[PDB]
Structures are given as structure tokens and as C-alpha cells.
Design a protein around this ligand. Sequence first.
Ligand SMILES: [Mg+2]
Length: 119
Amino acid sequence: INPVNNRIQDLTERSDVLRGYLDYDAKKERLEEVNAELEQPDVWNEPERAQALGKERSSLEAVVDTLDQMKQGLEDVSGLLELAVEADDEETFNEAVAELDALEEKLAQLEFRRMFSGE
RNA sequence: AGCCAGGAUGUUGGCUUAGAAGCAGCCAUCAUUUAAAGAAAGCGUAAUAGCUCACUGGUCGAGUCGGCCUGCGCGGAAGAU
Ligand SMILES: [Mg+2]
């Protein structure tokens, strides 16, 4: 269990680091304005511009959305772990141990993507 | 051959894409209500939407379709006293 324990916190830390690197607030802000623009119906009259806007939005959402998921997913995992601890059941514990890996992998992938920006 | 009607459902098939809803592609090209309805032949769009088409049901009420063999013609075919 000690390794599992180590993995929960470490993952969180790395997520935090990633977020910091991103400087996510700016991105969020951009998304917001972009979202607002999209909501306004006059943007779609000019097609190319609209398309561009759409392109801009999704990525912004997704990076930010990914981050959100990580934040939330991690929390969920923690909760699960807590539950397991409280109720001495093996299956739950096992689940707690396992589910975290996927999130970590996702995070890693995201980081990799961030790294290799050039075409 | 025209003419009148439908030209549905799962479904907007997923994806990758910025979006993809027959129609950017890439791929499967299946099944349903059955009279019949292509996971779609063309137009159309931001993409849907929208407008046709395929096949099929009515009207009508006799011939009709496009290959082959050969005859004769047509275009292709502009020049300097
Ligand atoms: Mg001749």
C-alpha cells in the first residue's frame, strides 16, 4: 500500500506543476471571451472567422478541461481511498489502488503534447 | 415519355476534424416500417436545414428500348492576282 500512497500525492503534485507551467488562468480568460463571442449569433455570418473562433475555443477548453478533470479525478480517487480505509474491504482498496494509474498516464500524455509544440 | 404522391426509421453510422448531421474525407455499405425509400447520384450550406434524383404507387392506354450488320449522306474542313 505504501507505493500506492506515494503515487496518489505525487500525481497530484505533478498535475499542479503542469498547471503552473501552462499558466492556465490566461487560457481560461481567453476561452471565456471566445465562448461569449460564439454565443453571439453575428459571429457565424462571417464563416472563416467563426471557424477560427471555434478552433480556438475547443483547444482552450480541452487543456483547461483536462486540468479540471485531473483536479477532480484526483479528488475522486482520494475519496475512494478514504472510503476503502474506512470500510475494511479488499475490492474497494484494489479499485482505489488501480483507478489512479489511468489519470497519471493521461497527465503524462498531456505533458508530452505540451512539450512537443512544433510540427 | 410526361403528369399526381411518397422519397421514411436505427441515424446525425462513427471518427479526425475546427465542424462533418447522404454529400471534406477514411471506412463499413448493414439492418428496420415494407409499396418503395442509396449509411446516398447531383445541387445546396458555416453545418444542419433546404431543393432534386434512384427505386416505387397512381393516372394514361399502344407500341417501345438500344445494340449488331450493311447502303447513302452530315460535321471534322483555314491561304494568299
Ligand atoms: Mg466525311
